[PDB]
Coordinates of C-alpha atoms and ligand atoms in Angstrom, one line a residue:
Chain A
X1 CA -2.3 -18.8 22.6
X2 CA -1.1 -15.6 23.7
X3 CA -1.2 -12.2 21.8
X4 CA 2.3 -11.3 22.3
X5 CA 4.5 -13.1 25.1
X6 CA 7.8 -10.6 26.7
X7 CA 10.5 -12.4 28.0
X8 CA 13.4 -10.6 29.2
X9 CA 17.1 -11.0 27.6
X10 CA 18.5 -7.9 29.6
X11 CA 16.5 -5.8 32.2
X12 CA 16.2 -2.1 31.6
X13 CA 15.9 0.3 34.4
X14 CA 12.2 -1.4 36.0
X15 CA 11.6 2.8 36.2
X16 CA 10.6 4.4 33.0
X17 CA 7.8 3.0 30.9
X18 CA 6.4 3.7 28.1
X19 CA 3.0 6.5 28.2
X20 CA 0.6 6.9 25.0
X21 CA 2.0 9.8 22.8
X22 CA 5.7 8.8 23.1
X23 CA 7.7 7.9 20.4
X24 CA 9.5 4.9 21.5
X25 CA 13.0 4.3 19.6
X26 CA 14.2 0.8 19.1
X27 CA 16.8 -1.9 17.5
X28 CA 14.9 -4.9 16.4
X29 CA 15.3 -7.7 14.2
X30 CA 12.6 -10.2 13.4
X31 CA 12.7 -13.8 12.6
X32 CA 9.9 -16.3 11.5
X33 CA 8.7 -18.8 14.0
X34 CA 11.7 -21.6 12.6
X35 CA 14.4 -18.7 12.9
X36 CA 14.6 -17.0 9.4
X37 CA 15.6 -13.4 9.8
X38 CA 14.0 -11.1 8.0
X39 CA 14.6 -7.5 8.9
X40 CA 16.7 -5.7 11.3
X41 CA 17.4 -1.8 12.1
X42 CA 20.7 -2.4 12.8
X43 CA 21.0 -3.5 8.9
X44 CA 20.0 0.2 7.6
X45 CA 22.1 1.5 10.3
X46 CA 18.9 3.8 12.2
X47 CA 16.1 3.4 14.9
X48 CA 13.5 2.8 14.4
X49 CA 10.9 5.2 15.9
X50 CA 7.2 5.1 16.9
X51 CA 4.8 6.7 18.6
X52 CA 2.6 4.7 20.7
X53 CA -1.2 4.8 20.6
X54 CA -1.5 6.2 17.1
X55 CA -2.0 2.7 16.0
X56 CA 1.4 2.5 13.8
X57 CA 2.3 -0.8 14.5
X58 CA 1.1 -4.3 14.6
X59 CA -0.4 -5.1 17.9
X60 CA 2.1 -7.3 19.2
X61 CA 4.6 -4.4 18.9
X62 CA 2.1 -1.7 20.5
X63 CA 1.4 -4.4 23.5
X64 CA 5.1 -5.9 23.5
X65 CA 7.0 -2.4 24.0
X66 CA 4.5 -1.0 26.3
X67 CA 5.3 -3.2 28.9
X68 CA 9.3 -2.9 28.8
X69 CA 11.3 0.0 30.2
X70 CA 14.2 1.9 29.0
X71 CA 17.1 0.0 28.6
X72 CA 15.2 -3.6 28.1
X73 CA 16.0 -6.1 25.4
X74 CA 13.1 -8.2 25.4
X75 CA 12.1 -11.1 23.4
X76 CA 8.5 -10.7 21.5
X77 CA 6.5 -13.7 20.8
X78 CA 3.8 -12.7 18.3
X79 CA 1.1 -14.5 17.1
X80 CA -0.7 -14.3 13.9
X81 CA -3.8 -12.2 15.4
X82 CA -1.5 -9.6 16.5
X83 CA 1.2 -9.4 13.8
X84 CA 0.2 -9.8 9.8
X85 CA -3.0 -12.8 10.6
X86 CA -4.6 -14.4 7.9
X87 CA -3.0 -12.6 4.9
X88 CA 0.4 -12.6 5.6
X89 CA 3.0 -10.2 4.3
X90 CA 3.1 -11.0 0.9
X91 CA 6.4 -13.0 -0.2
X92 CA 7.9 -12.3 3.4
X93 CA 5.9 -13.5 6.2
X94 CA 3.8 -16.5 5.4
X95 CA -0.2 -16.7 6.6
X96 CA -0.9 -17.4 10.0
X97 CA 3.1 -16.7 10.9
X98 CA 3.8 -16.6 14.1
X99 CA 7.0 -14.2 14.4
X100 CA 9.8 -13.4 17.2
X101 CA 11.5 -9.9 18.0
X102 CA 14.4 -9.3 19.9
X103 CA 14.1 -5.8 20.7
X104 CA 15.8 -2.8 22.7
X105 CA 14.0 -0.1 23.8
X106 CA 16.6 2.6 23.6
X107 CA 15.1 5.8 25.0
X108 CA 12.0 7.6 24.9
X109 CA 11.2 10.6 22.9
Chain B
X1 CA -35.3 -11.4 8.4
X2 CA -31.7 -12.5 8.8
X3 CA -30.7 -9.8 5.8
X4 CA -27.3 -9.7 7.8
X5 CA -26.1 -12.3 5.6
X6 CA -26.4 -9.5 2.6
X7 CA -24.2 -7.1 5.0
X8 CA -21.9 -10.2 5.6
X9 CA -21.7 -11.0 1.7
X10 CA -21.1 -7.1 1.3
X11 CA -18.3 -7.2 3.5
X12 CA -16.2 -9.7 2.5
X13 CA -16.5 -8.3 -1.1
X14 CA -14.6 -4.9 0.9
X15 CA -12.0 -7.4 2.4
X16 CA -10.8 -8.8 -1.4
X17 CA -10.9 -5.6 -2.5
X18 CA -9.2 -3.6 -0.4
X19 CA -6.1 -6.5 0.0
X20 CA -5.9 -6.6 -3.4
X21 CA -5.1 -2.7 -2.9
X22 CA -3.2 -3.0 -0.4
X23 CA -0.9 -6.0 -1.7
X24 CA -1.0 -3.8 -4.8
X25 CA 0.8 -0.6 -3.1
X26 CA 3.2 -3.0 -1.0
X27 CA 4.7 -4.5 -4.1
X28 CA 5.5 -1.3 -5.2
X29 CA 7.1 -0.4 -2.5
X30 CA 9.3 -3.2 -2.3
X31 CA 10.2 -3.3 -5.9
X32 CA 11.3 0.9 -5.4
X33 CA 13.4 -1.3 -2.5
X34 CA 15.1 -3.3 -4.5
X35 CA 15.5 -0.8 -6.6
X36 CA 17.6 0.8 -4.5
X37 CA 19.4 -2.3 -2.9
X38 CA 20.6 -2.8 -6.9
X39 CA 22.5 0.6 -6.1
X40 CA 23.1 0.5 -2.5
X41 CA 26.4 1.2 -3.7
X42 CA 26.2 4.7 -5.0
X43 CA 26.5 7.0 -1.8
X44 CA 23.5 8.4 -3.4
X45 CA 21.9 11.1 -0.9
X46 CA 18.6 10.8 -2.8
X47 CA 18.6 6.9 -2.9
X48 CA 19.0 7.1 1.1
X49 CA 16.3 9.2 2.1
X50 CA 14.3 6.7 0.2
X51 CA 15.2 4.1 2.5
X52 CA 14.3 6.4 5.4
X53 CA 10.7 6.6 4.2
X54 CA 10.7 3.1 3.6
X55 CA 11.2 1.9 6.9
X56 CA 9.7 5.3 8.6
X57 CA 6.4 5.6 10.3
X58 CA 4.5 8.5 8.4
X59 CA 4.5 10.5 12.0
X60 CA 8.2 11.5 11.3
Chain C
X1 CA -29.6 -18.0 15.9
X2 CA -28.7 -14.5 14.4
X3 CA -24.7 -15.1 15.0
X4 CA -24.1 -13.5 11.8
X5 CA -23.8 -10.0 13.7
X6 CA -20.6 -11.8 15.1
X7 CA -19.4 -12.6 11.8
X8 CA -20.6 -8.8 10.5
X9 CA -18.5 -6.8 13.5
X10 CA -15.5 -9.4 13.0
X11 CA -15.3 -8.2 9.2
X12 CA -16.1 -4.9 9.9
X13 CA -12.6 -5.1 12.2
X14 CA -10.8 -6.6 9.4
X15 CA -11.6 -3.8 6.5
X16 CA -10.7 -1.1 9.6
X17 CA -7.4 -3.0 9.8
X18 CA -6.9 -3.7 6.1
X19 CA -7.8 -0.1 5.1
X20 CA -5.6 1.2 7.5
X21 CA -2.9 -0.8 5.9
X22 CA -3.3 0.4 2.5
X23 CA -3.4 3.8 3.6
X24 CA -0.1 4.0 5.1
X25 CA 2.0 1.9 1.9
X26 CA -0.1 4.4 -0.4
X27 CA 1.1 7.3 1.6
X28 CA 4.9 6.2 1.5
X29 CA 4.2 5.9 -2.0
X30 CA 2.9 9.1 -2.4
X31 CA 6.0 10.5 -0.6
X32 CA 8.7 8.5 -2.7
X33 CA 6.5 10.4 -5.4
X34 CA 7.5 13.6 -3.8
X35 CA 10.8 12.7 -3.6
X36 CA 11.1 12.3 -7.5
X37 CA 9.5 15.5 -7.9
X38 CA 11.9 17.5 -6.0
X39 CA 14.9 15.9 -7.7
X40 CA 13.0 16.0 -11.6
X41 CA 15.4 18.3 -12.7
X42 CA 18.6 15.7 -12.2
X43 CA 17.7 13.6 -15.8
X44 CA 19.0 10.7 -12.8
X45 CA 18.4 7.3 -14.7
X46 CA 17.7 5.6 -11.1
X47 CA 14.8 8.0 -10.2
X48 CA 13.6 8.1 -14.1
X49 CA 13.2 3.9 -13.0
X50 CA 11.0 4.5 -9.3
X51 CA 8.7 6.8 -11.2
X52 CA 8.0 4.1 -13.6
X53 CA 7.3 1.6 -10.7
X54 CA 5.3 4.2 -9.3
X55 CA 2.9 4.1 -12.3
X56 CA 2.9 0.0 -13.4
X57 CA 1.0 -2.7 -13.2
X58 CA 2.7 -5.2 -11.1
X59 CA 2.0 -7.5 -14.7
X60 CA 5.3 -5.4 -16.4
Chain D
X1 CA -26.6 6.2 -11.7
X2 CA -24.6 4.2 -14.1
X3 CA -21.3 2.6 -13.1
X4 CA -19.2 3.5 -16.4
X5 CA -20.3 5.6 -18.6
X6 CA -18.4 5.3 -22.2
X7 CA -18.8 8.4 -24.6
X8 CA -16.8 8.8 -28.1
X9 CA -14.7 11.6 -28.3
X10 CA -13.4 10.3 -31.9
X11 CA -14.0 7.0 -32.9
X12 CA -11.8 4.0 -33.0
X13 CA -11.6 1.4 -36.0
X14 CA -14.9 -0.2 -34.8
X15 CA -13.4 -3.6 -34.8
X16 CA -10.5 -4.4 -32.9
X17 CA -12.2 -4.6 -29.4
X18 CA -10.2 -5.9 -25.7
X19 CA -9.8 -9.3 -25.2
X20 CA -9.2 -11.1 -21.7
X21 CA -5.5 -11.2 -21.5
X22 CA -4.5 -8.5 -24.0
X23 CA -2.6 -5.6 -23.0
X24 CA -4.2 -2.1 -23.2
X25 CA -2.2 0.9 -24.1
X26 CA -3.5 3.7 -23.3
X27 CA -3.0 7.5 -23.0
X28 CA -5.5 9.5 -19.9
X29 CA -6.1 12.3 -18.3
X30 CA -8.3 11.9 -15.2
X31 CA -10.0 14.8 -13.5
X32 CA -12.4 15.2 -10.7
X33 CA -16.4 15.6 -11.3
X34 CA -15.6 19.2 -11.2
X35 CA -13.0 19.1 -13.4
X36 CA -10.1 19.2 -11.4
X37 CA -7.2 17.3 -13.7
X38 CA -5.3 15.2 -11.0
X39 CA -3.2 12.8 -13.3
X40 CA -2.3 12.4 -17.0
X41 CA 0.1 9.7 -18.5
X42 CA 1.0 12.3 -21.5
X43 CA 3.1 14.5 -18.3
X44 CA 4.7 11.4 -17.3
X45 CA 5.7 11.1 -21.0
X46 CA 4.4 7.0 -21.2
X47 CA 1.7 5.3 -22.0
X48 CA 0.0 3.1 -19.6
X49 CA -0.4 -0.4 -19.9
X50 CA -2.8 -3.2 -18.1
X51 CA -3.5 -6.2 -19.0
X52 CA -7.6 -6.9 -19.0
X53 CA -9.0 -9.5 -16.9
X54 CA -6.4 -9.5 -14.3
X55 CA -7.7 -7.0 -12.3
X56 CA -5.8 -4.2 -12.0
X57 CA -8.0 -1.5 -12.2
X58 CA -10.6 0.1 -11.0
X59 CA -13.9 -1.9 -12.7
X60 CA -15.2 1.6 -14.2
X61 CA -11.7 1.1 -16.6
X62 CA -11.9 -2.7 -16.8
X63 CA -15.3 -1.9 -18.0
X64 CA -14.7 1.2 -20.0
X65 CA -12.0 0.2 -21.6
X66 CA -13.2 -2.9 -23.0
X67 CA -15.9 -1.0 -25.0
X68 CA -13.3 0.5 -27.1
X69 CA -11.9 -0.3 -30.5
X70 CA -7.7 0.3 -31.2
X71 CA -8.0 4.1 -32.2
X72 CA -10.8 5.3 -30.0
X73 CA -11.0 8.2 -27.7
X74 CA -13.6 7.8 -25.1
X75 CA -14.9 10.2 -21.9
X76 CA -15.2 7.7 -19.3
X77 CA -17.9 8.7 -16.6
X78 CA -17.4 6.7 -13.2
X79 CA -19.6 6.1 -10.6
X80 CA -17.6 6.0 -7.0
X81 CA -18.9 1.9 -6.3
X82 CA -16.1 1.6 -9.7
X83 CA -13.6 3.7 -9.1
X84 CA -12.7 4.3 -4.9
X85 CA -15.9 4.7 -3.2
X86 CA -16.4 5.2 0.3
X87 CA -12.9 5.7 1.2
X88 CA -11.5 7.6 -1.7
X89 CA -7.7 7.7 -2.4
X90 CA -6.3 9.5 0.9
X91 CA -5.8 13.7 0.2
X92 CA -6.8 13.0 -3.8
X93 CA -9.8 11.2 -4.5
X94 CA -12.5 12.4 -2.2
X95 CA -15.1 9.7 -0.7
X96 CA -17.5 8.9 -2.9
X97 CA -16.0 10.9 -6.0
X98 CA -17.6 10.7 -9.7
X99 CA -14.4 10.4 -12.1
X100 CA -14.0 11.7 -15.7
X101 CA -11.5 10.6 -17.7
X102 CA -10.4 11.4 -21.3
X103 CA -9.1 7.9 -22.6
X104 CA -7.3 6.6 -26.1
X105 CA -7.0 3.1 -26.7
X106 CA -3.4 3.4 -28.7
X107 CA -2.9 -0.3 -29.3
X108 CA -3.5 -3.9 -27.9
X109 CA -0.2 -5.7 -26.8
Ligands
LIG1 C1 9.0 -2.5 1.3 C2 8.5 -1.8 2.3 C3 7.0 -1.7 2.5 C4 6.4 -2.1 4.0 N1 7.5 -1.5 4.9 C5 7.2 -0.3 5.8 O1 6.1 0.2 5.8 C6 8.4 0.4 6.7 O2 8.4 -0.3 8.0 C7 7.3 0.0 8.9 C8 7.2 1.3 9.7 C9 6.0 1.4 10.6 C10 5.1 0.3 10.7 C11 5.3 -0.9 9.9 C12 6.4 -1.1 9.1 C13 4.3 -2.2 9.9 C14 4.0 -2.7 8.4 C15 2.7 -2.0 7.8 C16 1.5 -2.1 9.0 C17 1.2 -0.9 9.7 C18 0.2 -1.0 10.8 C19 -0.5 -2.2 11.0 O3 -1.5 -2.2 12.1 C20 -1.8 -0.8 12.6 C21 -0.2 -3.4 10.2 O4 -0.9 -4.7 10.4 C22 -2.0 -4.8 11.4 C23 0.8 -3.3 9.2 O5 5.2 -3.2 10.5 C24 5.1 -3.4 11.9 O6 4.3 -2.8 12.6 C25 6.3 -4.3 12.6 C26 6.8 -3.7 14.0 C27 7.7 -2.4 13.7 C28 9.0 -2.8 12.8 C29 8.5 -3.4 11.4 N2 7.5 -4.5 11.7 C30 7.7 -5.8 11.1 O7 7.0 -6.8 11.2 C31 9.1 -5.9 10.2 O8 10.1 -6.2 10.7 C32 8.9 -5.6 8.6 C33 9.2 -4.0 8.4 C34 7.4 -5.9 8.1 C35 10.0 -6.6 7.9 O9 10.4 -6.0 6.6 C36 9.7 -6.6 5.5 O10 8.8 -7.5 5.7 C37 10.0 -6.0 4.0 C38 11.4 -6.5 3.6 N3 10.0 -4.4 4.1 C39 8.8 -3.7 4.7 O11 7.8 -4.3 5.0 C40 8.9 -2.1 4.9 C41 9.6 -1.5 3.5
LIG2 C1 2.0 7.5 -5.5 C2 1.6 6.4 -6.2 C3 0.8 5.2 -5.5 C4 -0.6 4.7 -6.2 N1 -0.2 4.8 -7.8 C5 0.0 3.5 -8.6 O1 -0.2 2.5 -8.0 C6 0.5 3.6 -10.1 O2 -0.7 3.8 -11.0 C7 -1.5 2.6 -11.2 C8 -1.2 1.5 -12.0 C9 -2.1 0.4 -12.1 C10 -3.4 0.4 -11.3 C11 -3.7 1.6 -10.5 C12 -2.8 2.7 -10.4 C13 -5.0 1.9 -9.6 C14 -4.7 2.4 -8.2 C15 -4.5 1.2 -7.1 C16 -5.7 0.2 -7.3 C17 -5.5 -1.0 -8.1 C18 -6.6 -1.9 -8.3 C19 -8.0 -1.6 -7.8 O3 -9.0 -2.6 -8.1 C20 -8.6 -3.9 -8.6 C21 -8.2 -0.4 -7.0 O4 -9.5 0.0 -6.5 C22 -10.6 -0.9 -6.6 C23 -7.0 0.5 -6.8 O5 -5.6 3.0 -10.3 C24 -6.5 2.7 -11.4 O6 -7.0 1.6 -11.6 C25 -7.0 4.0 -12.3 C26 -7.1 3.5 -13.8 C27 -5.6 3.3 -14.5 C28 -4.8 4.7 -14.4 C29 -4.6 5.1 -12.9 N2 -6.0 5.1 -12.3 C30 -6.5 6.4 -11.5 O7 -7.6 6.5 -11.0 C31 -5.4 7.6 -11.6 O8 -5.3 8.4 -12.5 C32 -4.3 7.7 -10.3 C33 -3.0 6.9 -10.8 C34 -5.0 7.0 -9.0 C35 -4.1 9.3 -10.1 O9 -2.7 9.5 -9.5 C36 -2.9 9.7 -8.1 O10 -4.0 9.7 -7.5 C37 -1.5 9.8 -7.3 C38 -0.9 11.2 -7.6 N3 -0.5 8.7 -7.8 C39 -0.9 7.3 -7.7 O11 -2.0 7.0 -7.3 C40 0.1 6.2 -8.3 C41 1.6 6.6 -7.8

């Protein structure tokens, strides 16, 4: 099945995409494949902030957010290869855990 | 002739190892997170810019 | 016949990933550590309980 | 070369040796192969403890360590393939680093 699947929830601007060496700043929160939330940057009240092709993220994210533009909330459909696999997050995300983001791409720095 | 199993064998000797490390470090961190989730209550300055590294990317 | 060169450059993917990993909790770590060591001079009995996270075995 | 080498600084009791499952207490100092000091439990004023067997250490102090009696003070000599090898420990532990440390086996918990 698919690395990461984007579905839209609300369209951004269709204009400005993300380029290789931008940091891209976001509001996420992330839930197991049966719904159980288990982070969100609107908890600790920040961003957060990457910069994409230094390899910071799980692939799912560096794929995901690539393809939306600024203003997008997307939904992220991860699978296992492209998040935390085989080994899991220990405690948090199970092996072989598929995982869904809902995600805003606020602006690009 | 097939000695690749030796590099095979090697490699997956790197795998447990280096998970081991890494779910080492990672429990750590999250401990020093609850940690401070035990005094998220505190308005502690120090205590805060903790939570920013926690959740930072070590670009920034 | 010799498929085990697929299984080598699969593992060799895996410790790239998995040391990657390792490096970036360690470094968060490291500046947590940093942190302490610009506030050890606040006898703070929060801080005084990361440092001694930062040097445990998860065992204790 | 020799993946732990254990020399006696003072000698222990000579009897009470490390058992699987027992708690080491310890006090170190570990420095480079050039003698750079980069840690010592006596500055963070507390003895370390591990538990043998459970693998929490590098093998060159599971191995070490276990050759000592309660009172001992050992130089440990480490080959990198027992303490952090090829990669090192990023911006402290150089690839392929020899380590020296200067160990005392307080008591077993
Ligand atoms: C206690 C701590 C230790 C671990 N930690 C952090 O390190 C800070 O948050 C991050 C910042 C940048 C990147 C990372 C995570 C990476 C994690 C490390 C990593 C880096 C790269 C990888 O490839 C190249 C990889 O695997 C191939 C793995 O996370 C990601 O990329 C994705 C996409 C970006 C948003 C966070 N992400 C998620 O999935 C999540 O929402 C979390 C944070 C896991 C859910 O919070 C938890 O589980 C527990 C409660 N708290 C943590 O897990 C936090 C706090
Ligand atoms: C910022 C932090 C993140 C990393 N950290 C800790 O995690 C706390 O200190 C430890 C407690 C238990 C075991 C461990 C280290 C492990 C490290 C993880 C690990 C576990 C298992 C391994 O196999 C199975 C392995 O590799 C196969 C690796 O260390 C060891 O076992 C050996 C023997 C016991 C005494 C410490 N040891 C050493 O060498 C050292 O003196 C240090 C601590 C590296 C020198 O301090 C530094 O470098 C920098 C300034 N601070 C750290 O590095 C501290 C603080």
């Amino acid at each position: 099945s698919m690395g990461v699947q984007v579905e839209t929830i609300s369209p951004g601007d269709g204009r400005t995409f993300p380029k290789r060496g931008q940091t891209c700043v976001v509001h996420y929160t992330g839930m197991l494949e049966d719904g159980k939330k288990f982070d969100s940057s609107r908890d600790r009240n920040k961003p957060f902030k990457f910069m994409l092709g230094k390899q910071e993220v799980i692939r799912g994210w560096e794929e995901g957010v690539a393809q939306m533009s600024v203003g997008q909330r997307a939904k992220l459909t991860i699978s296992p290869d492209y998040a935390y696999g085989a080994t899991g997050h220990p405690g948090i995300i199970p092996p072989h855990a598929t995982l869904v983001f809902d995600v805003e791409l606020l602006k690009l720095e | 002739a097939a000695e690749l199993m030796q590099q095979v064998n090697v490699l997956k000797l790197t795998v447990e190892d280096l998970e081991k490390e890494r779910d080492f470090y990672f429990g750590k961190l999250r401990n020093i997170e609850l940690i401070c989730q035990e005094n998220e209550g505190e308005n502690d300055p120090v205590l805060q810019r903790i939570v920013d590294i926690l959740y930072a990317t070590d670009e920034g």
